[PDB]
Amino acid sequence: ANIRVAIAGAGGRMGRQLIQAALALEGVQLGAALEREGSSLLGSDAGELAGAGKTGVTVQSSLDAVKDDFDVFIDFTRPEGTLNHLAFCRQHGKGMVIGTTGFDEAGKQAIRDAAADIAIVFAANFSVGVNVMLKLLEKAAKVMGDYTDIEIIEAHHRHKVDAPSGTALAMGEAIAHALDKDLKDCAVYSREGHTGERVPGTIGFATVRAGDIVGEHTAMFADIGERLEITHKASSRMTFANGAVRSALWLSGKESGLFDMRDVLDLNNL
Amino acid sequence: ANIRVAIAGAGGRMGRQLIQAALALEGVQLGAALEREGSSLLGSDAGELAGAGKTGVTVQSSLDAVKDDFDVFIDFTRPEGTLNHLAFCRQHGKGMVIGTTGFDEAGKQAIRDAAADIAIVFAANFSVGVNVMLKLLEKAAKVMGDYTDIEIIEAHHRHKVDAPSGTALAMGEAIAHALDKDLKDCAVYSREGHTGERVPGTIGFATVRAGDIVGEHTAMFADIGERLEITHKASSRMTFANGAVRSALWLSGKESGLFDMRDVLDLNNL
Amino acid sequence: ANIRVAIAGAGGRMGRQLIQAALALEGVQLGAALEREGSSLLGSDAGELAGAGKTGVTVQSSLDAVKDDFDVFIDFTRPEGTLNHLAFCRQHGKGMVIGTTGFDEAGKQAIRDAAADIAIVFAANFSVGVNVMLKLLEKAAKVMGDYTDIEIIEAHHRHKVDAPSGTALAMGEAIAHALDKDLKDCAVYSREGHTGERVPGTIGFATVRAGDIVGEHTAMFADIGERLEITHKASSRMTFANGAVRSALWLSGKESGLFDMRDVLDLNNL
Amino acid sequence: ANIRVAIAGAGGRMGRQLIQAALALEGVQLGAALEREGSSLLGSDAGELAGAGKTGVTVQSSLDAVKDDFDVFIDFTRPEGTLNHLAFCRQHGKGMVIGTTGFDEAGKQAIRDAAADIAIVFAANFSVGVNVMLKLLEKAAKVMGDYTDIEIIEAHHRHKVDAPSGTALAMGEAIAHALDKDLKDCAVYSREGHTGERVPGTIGFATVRAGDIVGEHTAMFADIGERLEITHKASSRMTFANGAVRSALWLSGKESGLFDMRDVLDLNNL
Ligand SMILES: NC(=O)c1ccc[n+]([C@@H]2O[C@H](COP(=O)([O-])OP(=O)(O)OC[C@H]3O[C@@H](n4cnc5c(N)ncnc54)[C@H](O)[C@@H]3O)[C@@H](O)[C@H]2O)c1
Ligand SMILES: NC(=O)c1ccc[n+]([C@@H]2O[C@H](COP(=O)([O-])OP(=O)(O)OC[C@H]3O[C@@H](n4cnc5c(N)ncnc54)[C@H](O)[C@@H]3O)[C@@H](O)[C@H]2O)c1
Ligand SMILES: NC(=O)c1ccc[n+]([C@@H]2O[C@H](COP(=O)([O-])OP(=O)(O)OC[C@H]3O[C@@H](n4cnc5c(N)ncnc54)[C@H](O)[C@@H]3O)[C@@H](O)[C@H]2O)c1
Ligand SMILES: NC(=O)c1ccc[n+]([C@@H]2O[C@H](COP(=O)([O-])OP(=O)(O)OC[C@H]3O[C@@H](n4cnc5c(N)ncnc54)[C@H](O)[C@@H]3O)[C@@H](O)[C@H]2O)c1
Incomplete structure (x- = not known):
């Protein structure tokens, strides 16, 4: 029941866990479920993937297709995929939780740059x-x-x-x-x-x-x-899925800026 | 070479370690070495006890005997012994490091009370x-x-x-x-x-x-x-001997107040 | 490619793991997949359940239905279910690997008794x-x-x-x-x-x-x-699924007797 | 009260522990306490060294001096010292427990060779x-x-x-x-x-x-x-002192052969 999220990489090791983590979390709804076009687009979501229920939430291939379907975008995919989603979310103020790794300097640079128009949590480790x-x-x-x-x-x-x-x-x-x-x-x-x-x-x-x-x-x-x-x-890898979802939620109310877990967890004043 | 310390309980499990810890520590000299009167007053100190050197520092039985010999008094003995030393140190501004345990309420009470005339570090655990x-x-x-x-x-x-x-x-x-x-x-x-x-x-x-x-x-x-x-x-028990000695040293410059390891270690602002 | 096995409890926590463990193990084929009649008989098997492939092996409800489909029966269900399967396997020489727990004395007693006509591995812990x-x-x-x-x-x-x-x-x-x-x-x-x-x-x-x-x-x-x-x-619970399957395999060539992991693992001569 | 032992290296890290371990062990008496000639021959033994009692057993420098004083010789010193003691014990059937390390091939070779006239336990690790x-x-x-x-x-x-x-x-x-x-x-x-x-x-x-x-x-x-x-x-190093002494004792009744802890502990038939 709140904030909807989209989960890119929906059939990868991380996207499933991420679905389970999302349902299970409260104060968060599952808006969209992406995968890329060409796969068995593994039965339009549900417990389909995340071994969960069913959810009238069905996996897709189109960013613009779902645009009104989620508020925050969570990505644990590949730098290249990320950069695309990044451009779309940036276009239409859509917040990102990013846990994809291995960017090159140019990579990271887009991120900080997308960070003045949208709110992004970018972290190496989300546990x-x-x-x-x-x-x-x-x-x-x-x-x-x-x-x-x-x-x-x-x-x-x-x-x-x-x-x-x-x-x-x-x-x-x-x-x-x-x-x-x-x-x-x-x-x-x-x-x-x-x-x-x-x-x-x-x-x-x-x-x-x-x-x-x-x-x-x-x-x-x-x-x-x-x-x-x-x-x-x-x-288990649920440890990062949990903390990605917690940050998606934390993003609520957030207009823009680049953040990480210290921000989410307020480890700062700690 | 600085501050001298007296070690009550000099032949007990803790007093030896305390001697070794003291020599070994720098910025601290071994002023006196007490034991109670009646024991084999185990060869007037040295490596005698603390398996160390020799030290013209020889174990004793008299508080007033050594009064000019130490600046800070370290006690890991018995509540009853403590209370005595406590009275003496209190009389003549002599700081205490106390690690004896098992006081009764009246016990603890003397301590806080001696704490407005001398400076005392009192702690349950000195590691x-x-x-x-x-x-x-x-x-x-x-x-x-x-x-x-x-x-x-x-x-x-x-x-x-x-x-x-x-x-x-x-x-x-x-x-x-x-x-x-x-x-x-x-x-x-x-x-x-x-x-x-x-x-x-x-x-x-x-x-x-x-x-x-x-x-x-x-x-x-x-x-x-x-x-x-x-x-x-x-x-090994050296862990507390070390931290008792570190606190004895920390007491340097200290007139009075009741303290513990958070004070010594400044865990407070930490 | 060898010995086929049936997996009772096919949608329970243990039956899935048991399916994965079985495929994955070599020298073992997946003959039957039971569940009880009344459940959503969760899509006639496959990766259906065990998040695996698909397998023309589809879950069922009938013991006699599959009788020619498996050689060894693996049970991690309930004492009551067990006792039934037990009777069937006993009837038609079908070996059991049993890991269901909580029998009463009468329970255990049937087991030892079924043990002179079929070969059974019965163990509390299969890791x-x-x-x-x-x-x-x-x-x-x-x-x-x-x-x-x-x-x-x-x-x-x-x-x-x-x-x-x-x-x-x-x-x-x-x-x-x-x-x-x-x-x-x-x-x-x-x-x-x-x-x-x-x-x-x-x-x-x-x-x-x-x-x-x-x-x-x-x-x-x-x-x-x-x-x-x-x-x-x-x-993870795969640890017991693995050892149940290893014992199913070990049962190969075995006519009858009651055994456990020391037998399987030859911990005896060890 | 039985078998007496001599402890070479009596003021080194291992010889003290070895004294304590020996007294403390039962069925073993402390016959001799060697050190080399030139040291402060640290007060003819006792709790002197091993922080123990006193023992009319006083440290020495002469092998022939004590020959009738011990039955088994325990060595945790230096290869060179060992080889000497080795020659003496070999001369007069005196058993060795050897834990000195770092021999060269020639070293080890004397050992196996002394092993047909005396009984020796030679081990790298005596825990x-x-x-x-x-x-x-x-x-x-x-x-x-x-x-x-x-x-x-x-x-x-x-x-x-x-x-x-x-x-x-x-x-x-x-x-x-x-x-x-x-x-x-x-x-x-x-x-x-x-x-x-x-x-x-x-x-x-x-x-x-x-x-x-x-x-x-x-x-x-x-x-x-x-x-x-x-x-x-x-x-603590008492762990090896204990097992050296246990082997000294085990040597009782033993005429000759080369052995180690598997022998002492009978890990063989185990
Ligand atoms: N930061 C963290 O705490 C954290 C933790 C674990 C893993 N990760 C990262 O998360 C990512 C996910 O790894 P995974 O184990 O899920 O492995 P995986 O192989 O399962 O993930 C790949 C997923 O990304 C999707 N994807 C791949 N390329 C894409 C593209 N160009 N466009 C759109 N979708 C694309 C795939 O379709 C698939 O869903 C990796 O970058 C990994 O480094 C991060
Ligand atoms: N707070 C810490 O971190 C810390 C740690 C370890 C132990 N301790 C405490 O330190 C004390 C020392 O214990 P120990 O293991 O050295 O055992 P122990 O038996 O060796 O200590 C007794 C020592 O106190 C002396 N003593 C006893 N009664 C006395 C008396 N009336 N007057 C003068 N001297 C007296 C004895 O003569 C001996 O030197 C105990 O109170 C123990 O609870 C505290
Ligand atoms: N021995 C071992 O090392 C080992 C290890 C783990 C668990 N176990 C045991 O294995 C069993 C399985 O537990 P689980 O976690 O899979 O939990 P679970 O609830 O998932 O298992 C129940 C499964 O048994 C089936 N079943 C229940 N009653 C039945 C009946 N009357 N007839 C037929 N099918 C029936 C259910 O349909 C379901 O498939 C338990 O008895 C547990 O004690 C043993
Ligand atoms: N095998 C085991 O489980 C085991 C365990 C611990 C150490 N060790 C060995 O035991 C030995 C003892 O080490 P340590 O820590 O006691 O250190 P250390 O320096 O205290 O030991 C030296 C001791 O050997 C004596 N010694 C030296 N050279 C000698 C010589 N030429 N003749 C006679 N006496 C001589 C010294 O006088 C001293 O007593 C070493 O060889 C070490 O490698 C073995």
């Missing part, structure tokens, strides 16, 4: 948990980070291709900044053979790849005699 | 780690605490007699307050047989007792799809 | 992982169990109603037997207030209930100076 | 826990190792110089053998940048270095839907 952990780790670095050893460990399924995750990296920068240094001057990503002694001031990263682990991140601050650990474990 | 975790858990409860399930797990050695630790309890109150409720209205300490379903809004506590674990505390905030955990592991 | 852990914990108890403190911790989602899980309980008995004692003479399930000291020889159990955790079990053997932990984490 | 875990991990690999991803994670204090520990390496070989392959053909020790996908069949190792962690080892076997983890956490 609330993760966004809080990043805030915590700062504080934490404030008082313990200094004199404590700092090591980040992250585990992911056997098909993740980049080591150490992007979240581990953000964790790393979050801290290094806190200590007001540069991640690049103090990071160590590998430890094989005779290393000699751990170097004070660095931030080691350890990386585990196995099974279907969706994502676990732990930050450690070790002194002599005690350890503080802050771990975030994602159990 | 920095723990004190930060407690600050974090609040913040955390702020944004996730609400709609997330909250469970505290703590492990301790097989001779701890009270379940769930005092730290778990403080963890619990730290949160419940954050959510602005009462720990007493929402706590669950045991789960045996047919419980039926977990009740939204409660804070379960699980308690593990085994071996020589000095102390591990984990707070969990579980949603559907993700978990944030904040764990503090004490590896 | 391979868990079945290995239970074997390990014995061995383990053999050499460390004795003089080490033993504590079992288990976490499950907020709608589990019985504390401490059935797996924790089996873990407990697995050990107690190893030490050749009785679980009932040495178990402790709760620890609230002044407990006094941990009692040598007992097996404490700690129980965590939160979010959507599907199931985590940890067994601890703590001495002075070291801890051995054996943890099994279920990430 | 019982670790020795059981290694046995478990085999079994485990037997049934799950194959099709599961295998990752070893180990943490150690900030002054350990070799990555991945020797225990992680032994863990690795223990498994690889189980699967009957070669550790060297399937190990991966580092994961930095674009790795591409995890390769089936390898054994990744992740390495954490921080604070004063004495040693934590975890072996993981991950499938789709479940994980089995076997973790061993050393809390």
